[PDB]
Design a protein around this nucleic acid. Structure first.
Ligand code: ZN
Lengths: 174, 511, 417
RNA sequence: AUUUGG
RNA sequence: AAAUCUUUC
């Protein structure tokens, strides 16, 4: 019962505290990777099992003429995943930590000295070349049928029910 | 070679200095300088400016972020064996957990509320009291700080008690909020380049610029100044307790405790120290000990010096200079108009730290350089090819790879040298996606993380959690076991091993 | 059961239904909806799950049975609950932010505030201090840099040979001869031999710094990359000769000679002595079976060796060359010489910057960058920014500083700015 | 930390 | 012995 020794005197701790416990070496990174052929084994595993499952994504094709200009701060607003998507990704077996990290809206300020006629937003590194980036609050609780819950009617007043059309638990507010 | 650059170059192409020297000498020198400033013979530590134009956020709810209360960085934990104080170095996570165990509290918020709610300093909050917490929080340990370019003599940082860390984190969060309210330059998400552009806009109306730095910054920001700023922004008893602990601080050097009543110890209240000068006057753009201001006549320069002296921001005569054609702040140099000064500037080299990590970091560095006008794209292409060749020379032995198929980097037994443009525009074999700066973590990074996490009797893992569960949720041993069992059962139901990695870029691209 | 949560719990469950129309959550603060004849165990009762829900502020637990479900309202407009459904319900319903009494404000004043304030008052306070007098003058001229270089040169002098800096050039011996020379040099110094590896044993240390002098520059450094790779390999493979394409070194652990029960295996913090071969013709010459070579040593820390081993010489040279001016030829002592000087010596300087773990050249470069952008500087103080001899100690860092200053002087002489 | 980098 | 309170299993 390490929980009784790590957090002696407390029967409950926050998830942040618990993870901090779960989650420096003078050896260089090269020697660490060489040790026990850990990097070689990881490369073999990646090439044999992990690599074939990687989804091939399309390449960038959009381009516009650009000219050197005064330094400016390009703002890229990368939106965060919505509840429906986050839940679908976690239920599909994706790493929950990565999904939670991506759940938050992100804003990136990058210095670029390059402008287009239409003032477009450029991809990372590809600014010189000109590769452009271009009621009831029905809530999806989960993608499963929780046991002993009401079936979704035609007019769900304010409760939480289960939808057959979409295999999920839907919460209707006001 | 840095001396013969046509443009501006700071010589950052090599890594920072390293040293195994003990921090005792540096800590002793810092304490001696603090004492000398305290006796008021070398520099000024008495704040005289008026901090009236600072909003009083006394009614703001007390906000605590738990992310910074736990970390692998060192910290000082104090024990009282038989009436004597023993200071031990331990990870900040372990120190905070021990603090919470000593005063039974579910989370730091409960500890803060209990500390602020007692009606006496001697009342018990578990196996301790507010008086004991204050007594223990004034003990610091000395550690060395190296790998800082331009600092051949490594500096001394100081590790504090978890209670001091908690109060400091609260006060610093609030001070940063006030700073952001003051001016738009202190927005949390602001790059050094954005700050430099803002400064160039601000100081465009005058002739001369005063690129300046403050000397003995930590040793000159007294506890009185911190308390004055905190009272100005309405910190209540938290600020008083923090100032009391700072005034009575002791540092354990070797095996002796040395009193350091003068000045703060290391950069901890950077927001408060900045806010001192910022609320004194709206004439500087300062980030701790780095400020920029402009003047038109010698009288304005004398007024600027008077303001700096009154704000306890002693000017550094060694590295403060006046310029008319250039501006510099946060190590970023611009022209008066706002353009980035031609030259390498702050570009830093990528040391060899893995067959694929090196390529990814080099790609990120070259992308940053090319997005600005640091170098043209063809130069970046040539540099990337050269780096790939060097990585091939360094990492192409059987101890790293046993493959010979194509589509692999030449450093992993393959015979392909991906062009920088092809890599950047996702025009490569999927194996190269990791090498992209925005791509998934490389194999080497995962291997290093696993090695660190596998180096005992540990608790059950609590990774791969549902995105909807907050990290502030209280969980017991049974709760953790149930969560792990449910997640493993669901993953098995999918006929799946450890969960598949998720990458935002790939997911958005294929959506 | 606190009255401050009556409004909070009232809005928590507006019209939620559980069976067909009946309210799912019954408020414990309302007589009409409260269940009569049963004890109250929470702010609300959930009929669907047959549970009790209680609301508590951040870090302010309430006196309720453990079975009661607690929903924590954090101070940053976020809510936490073990039951995901209740958390979602509170998040959706509490969109209208209504402040609840008892929230701990940052300005909260404790009962001991006055006592701590008096204690702070009784404690020592600082004195005013003197107001500095600042005179702004022009930046240092070529004469000042020349004066600094001459002062360094006359204070420390020069070595007869380049020592380990000469290891960047071929020693003129094949692999077998190099290995033989290294092994026989190790044997001649009475190094301990154990498990086929060499160890240097020490008993007493004269606690004073070693002799410091400026190393003259070899002609070139063709094997800089090879030398750095060898040093990187030696961080762990110590005690046996390590071979490269055109050079070899021997990193022997330096271990205390406690006695019969002495350290046998190197630990994390054990230092290394790196021995390298160069062309003969200096004091450190060694001969064996007709093979002659200059054997030069370097005592390196673990962190020093690690830092030196990770540097990328070729990429750094190319990046510097991207936007560089015409480098002039220089002599053995870093002096402008267009008659017999060599431009390859600059490469050597770069190698020195890689071998110096204190990276004093970085500080010199930062100060020179300040110098080139400066219209006026503080009198008699900015000039005292190139005087870094006190901040470093050793032959390698001293030579690095001296040649950084020489490079600054050469830039001022050849390409005035 | 040598097992295992030309 | 050396980049010397470091080379401290
Ligand atoms: Zn010699």
């Amino acid at each position: 019962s390490q929980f009784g020794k790590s957090f002696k005197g407390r029967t409950e701790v926050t998830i942040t505290e618990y993870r901090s416990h779960t989650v420096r070496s003078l050896l260089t990174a090269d020697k660490s990777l060489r040790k026990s052929f850990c990097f070689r084994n990881a490369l073999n595993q990646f090439l044999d099992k992990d690599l074939p499952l990687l989804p091939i994504r399309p390449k960038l094709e959009s381009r516009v003429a650009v000219k050197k200009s005064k330094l400016r701060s390009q703002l890229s607003f990368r939106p965060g995943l919505t509840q429906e998507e986050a839940i679908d990704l976690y239920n599909k077996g994706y790493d929950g930590d990565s999904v939670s990290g991506a759940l938050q809206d992100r804003v990136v300020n990058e210095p670029v000295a390059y402008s287009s006629a239409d003032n477009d937003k450029f991809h990372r590194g590809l600014a010189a070349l000109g590769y452009t980036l271009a009621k009831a609050k029905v809530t999806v609780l989960s993608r499963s049928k929780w046991m002993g819950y009401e079936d979704l009617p035609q007019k769900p007043p304010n409760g939480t029910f289960y939808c057959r059309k979409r295999k999920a638990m839907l919460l209707i507010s006001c | 070679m840095w001396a013969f650059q046509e443009g501006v170059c700071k010589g950052n192409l090599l890594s920072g200095p390293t040293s195994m020297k003990a921090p005792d000498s540096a800590a002793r020198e810092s304490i001696d300088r603090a004492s000398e400033i305290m006796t008021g013979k070398s520099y000024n530590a008495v704040h005289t400016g008026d901090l009236s134009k600072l909003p009083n956020q006394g009614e703001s709810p007390l906000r605590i972020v738990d992310s910074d209360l736990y970390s692998e960085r060192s910290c000082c934990w104090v024990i009282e064996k038989e009436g004597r104080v023993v200071c031990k170095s331990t990870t900040l996570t372990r120190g905070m957990t021990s603090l919470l165990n000593t005063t039974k509290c579910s989370s730091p918020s409960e500890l803060i509320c209990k500390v602020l709610t007692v009606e006496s300093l001697s009342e018990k909050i578990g196996d301790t009291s507010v008086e004991e917490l204050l007594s223990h929080g004034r003990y610091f340990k000395c550690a060395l700080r190296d790998q800082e370019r331009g600092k051949p003599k490594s500096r001394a940082i100081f590790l504090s008690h978890p209670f001091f860390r908690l109060l400091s984190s609260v006060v610093e969060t609030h001070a940063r909020s006030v700073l952001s309210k003051v001016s738009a330059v202190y927005t949390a998400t602001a790059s050094a380049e954005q700050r430099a552009m803002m400064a160039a806009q601000v100081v465009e109306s005058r002739k001369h610029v005063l690129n300046g730095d403050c000397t003995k910054y930590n040793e000159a920001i007294d506890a009185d100044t911190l308390l004055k700023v905190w009272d100005a922004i309405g910190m209540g008893s938290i600020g008083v307790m923090l100032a009391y602990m700072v005034r009575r601080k002791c540092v354990l050097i070797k095996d002796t405790l040395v009193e350091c009543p003068g000045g703060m110890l290391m950069g901890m209240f950077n927001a408060t120290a900045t806010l001192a000068l910022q609320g004194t006057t709206d004439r500087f753009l300062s980030f701790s000990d780095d400020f920029i201001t402009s003047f038109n006549s010698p009288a304005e320069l004398r007024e600027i010096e008077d303001l700096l002296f009154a704000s306890c921001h002693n000017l550094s005569l060694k590295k403060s200079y006046i310029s008319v054609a250039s501006l510099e702040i946060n190590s970023c140099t611009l022209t008066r108009d706002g353009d980035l000064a031609t030259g390498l500037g702050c570009t830093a080299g990528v040391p060899f730290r893995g067959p694929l990590v090196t390529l990814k970091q080099t790609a990120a560095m070259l992308s940053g350089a090319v997005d600005s006008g640091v170098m043209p794209f063809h130069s970046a292409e040539r540099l990337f090819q050269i780096k790939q060749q060097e990585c091939a020379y360094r990492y192409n032995n059987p101890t790293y790879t046993t493959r010979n198929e194509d589509f692999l980097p030449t450093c992993l037994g393959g015979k392909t040298v991906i062009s920088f443009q092809s890599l950047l525009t996702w025009d490569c074999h999927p194996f190269w996606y990791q090498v992209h700066p925005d791509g998934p973590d490389t194999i080497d990074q995962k291997v290093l993380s696993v090695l660190a996490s596998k180096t005992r009797t540990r608790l059950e893992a609590l990774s791969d959690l549902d995105p909807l569960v907050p990290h502030r949720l209280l969980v017991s041993e049974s709760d953790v076991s149930k969560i792990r069992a449910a997640r493993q059962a669901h993953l098995k139901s999918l006929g799946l091993e450890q969960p598949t990695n998720f990458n935002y870029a790939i997911y958005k691209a294929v959506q | 059961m606190d009255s401050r949560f009556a409004q909070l719990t009232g809005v928590f469950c507006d019209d939620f239904t559980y069976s067909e129309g009946s309210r799912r959550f019954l408020s414990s603060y309302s007589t009409v909806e409260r269940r009569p004849g049963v004890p109250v165990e929470g702010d609300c009762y959930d009929c669907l799950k047959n549970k009790w829900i209680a609301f508590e502020l951040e870090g302010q637990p309430r006196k309720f049975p453990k079975a009661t479900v607690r929903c924590i309202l954090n101070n940053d407009a976020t809510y936490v609950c073990s039951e995901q459904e209740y958390q979602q319900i509170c998040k959706v319903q509490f969109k209208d932010y209504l402040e609840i009494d008892g929230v701990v404000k940052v300005g909260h004043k404790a009962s001991y505030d006055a006592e701590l304030r008096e204690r702070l008052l009784e404690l020592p306070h600082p004195k005013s201090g003197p107001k500095p007098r600042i005179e702004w003058v022009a930046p240092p001229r070529l004469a000042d840099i020349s004066k600094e270089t001459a002062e360094l040169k006359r204070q420390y002098g020069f070595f007869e040979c380049s020592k380990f800096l000469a290891c960047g050039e071929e020693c003129g011996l094949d692999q077998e001869a190099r290995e033989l020379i290294l092994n026989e040099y190790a044997r001649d110094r009475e190094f301990e031999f154990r498990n086929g590896g060499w160890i240097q044993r020490y008993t007493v240390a004269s606690h004073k710094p070693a002799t410091q002098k400026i190393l003259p520059l070899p002609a070139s450094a063709p094997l800089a990359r090879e030398l750095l790779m060898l040093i990187a390999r030696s961080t762990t493979q110590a005690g046996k000769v390590l071979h490269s394409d055109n050079t070899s070194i021997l990193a022997v652990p330096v271990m205390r000679d406690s006695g019969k029960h002495s350290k046998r295996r190197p630990t994390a913090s054990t230092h290394h002595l790196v021995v390298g071969l160069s062309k003969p013709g200096c004091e450190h010459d060694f001969e064996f079976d007709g093979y002659r070579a200059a054997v030069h040593v370097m005592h390196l820390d673990p962190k020093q060796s690690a830092n030196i081993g990770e540097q990328d010489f070729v990429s750094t040279r190319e990046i510097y060359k991207l936007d560089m001016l015409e480098l002039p030829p220089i002599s053995r002592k870093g002096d402008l010489d267009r008659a017999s000087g060599l431009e390859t010596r600059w490469d050597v300087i770069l190698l020195l910057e890689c071998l110096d773990s204190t990276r004093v050249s970085q500080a010199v470069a930062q100060h020179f960058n300040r110098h080139r952008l400066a219209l006026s500087v503080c009198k008699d103080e900015f000039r005292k920014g190139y005087q870094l001899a006190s901040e470093i100690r050793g032959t390698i860092p001293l030579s690095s500083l001296y040649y950084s200053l020489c490079a600054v002087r050469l830039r001022m002489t050849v390409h005035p700015f």
